[PDB]
Amino acid sequence: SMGESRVILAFGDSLFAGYGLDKGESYPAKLETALRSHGINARIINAGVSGDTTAAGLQRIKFVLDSQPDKPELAIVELGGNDLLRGLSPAEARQNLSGILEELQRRKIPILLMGMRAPPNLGAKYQREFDGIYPYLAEKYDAKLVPFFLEAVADRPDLIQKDHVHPTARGVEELVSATSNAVAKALPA
């Protein structure tokens, strides 16, 4: 094909940074290769930062854009999962994301928003509130939306890395039942 590559900014968290993966296995890297099958030569800027909240993304979006030698032709925004992991306000996550999208819109950079979904642990009230921020933002900022970015691995534990193992309340009870003898024995009489 003719021409310089198309520049795409992948602005996200550990799901874009490729946490736990080897060189070339992150989503941005594999997406760049896959877009050749759509007739597109892309250079995808991996602006994934592991652990970034929406507030962290807002803090760096201007710097990341000003750092680019070539202006992005599309920005993919994938943030909010770490807000959920911290149990942080969904409203504040929406506000922070709004500031990120507003900066991209000022610069006339098209936006694709990756929708995040809350697990049931924080409860239905929180989950509904969190989940709804993404359709709200896509409409308000005229962004395209992937409603559920992680949908293709939702039902596939075999496609999810084993790393953090946080017991449920019932799991804690199991740990206590297995280890209390050792604790009692270690405590001097």
Numbering used by the authors: 0 to 188
What did the study's authors say about this model?
AlinE4 had one molecule in an asymmetric unit and was consisted of 11 α-helices (including two 310-helices) and 5 predominant β-strands. AlinE4 had a similar topology with CrmE10, as well as the α9 (Ala168-Ala185) wrapped in other chains and formed a symmetric dimer through the swapped C-terminal domain. For AlinE4, residues Ser13 and Asp162 on chain A and His165 on chain B were in a reasonable position of the catalytic triad, of which hydrogen bonds within the catalytic triad could be formed from Ser13-Oγ to His165-Nε2 and from His165-Nδ1 to Asp162-Oδ1. There was one density map around the catalytic sites in the crystal structure of AlinE4, which turned out to be one Cd2+ evidenced by electrochemistry analysis. In the crystal structure of AlinE4, Cd2+ interacted with residues Ser13 and His165, which were components of the catalytic triad. According to the characterization of AlinE4, Cd2+ had negative impacts on the enzymatic activity of AlinE4, evidenced by only retaining 20% activity at 10 mM CdCl2. The results suggested that Cd2+ might act on activity through (i) blocking proton transfer and (ii) protecting substrates from nucleophile attack. The region of these five sites in CrmE10 formed a negative potential surface; however, the corresponding region was full of positive potential in AlinE4. CrmE10 had about 30% activity at 4 °C and showed no activity above 40 °C, which indicated that CrmE10 was a cold-active enzyme. In contrast, AlinE4 was a mesophilic enzyme with over 32% activity above 60 °C. Interestingly, AlinE4 showed a relatively high thermostability, evidenced by that the enzyme activity was hardly affected after heat treatment at 70 °C for 1 h, and retained 20–40% activity after heat treatment at 100 °C for 1 h. AlinE4 displayed the highest activity (approximately 25.8 U/mg) toward p-NP butyrate (C4) at pH 7.5 and 40 °C (Km, Vmax and kcat of 0.10 mM, 26.9 µmol/mg/min and 25.8 s−1, respectively).
